[PDB]
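User: Please predict the structure of the protein below. I'd like the answer in structure-token form so I can feed it into my own downstream comparison script.

Assistant: Understood. Taking the following sequence of 71 residues as input:
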Amino acid sequence: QPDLGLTQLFADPNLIENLKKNPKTSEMMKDPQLVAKLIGYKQNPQAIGQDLFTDPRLMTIMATLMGVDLN
């Protein structure tokens, strides 16, 4: 119920590609530099759980992953 997925989903290997085609989250990949910054943040810092609060779109990414990428 609370929040959505977590660091594990994106911390995994290239998960942004999926994020590119079916979720609105792909907007950040094509424009903001934050994507690169986040990539490092996906690998080592479990702290992402607290950053979702600061990053609105990151939550959308969680939705797709947690939603089985169906709906």
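That's the full token string. The chain is about 60% helix and 0% strand.
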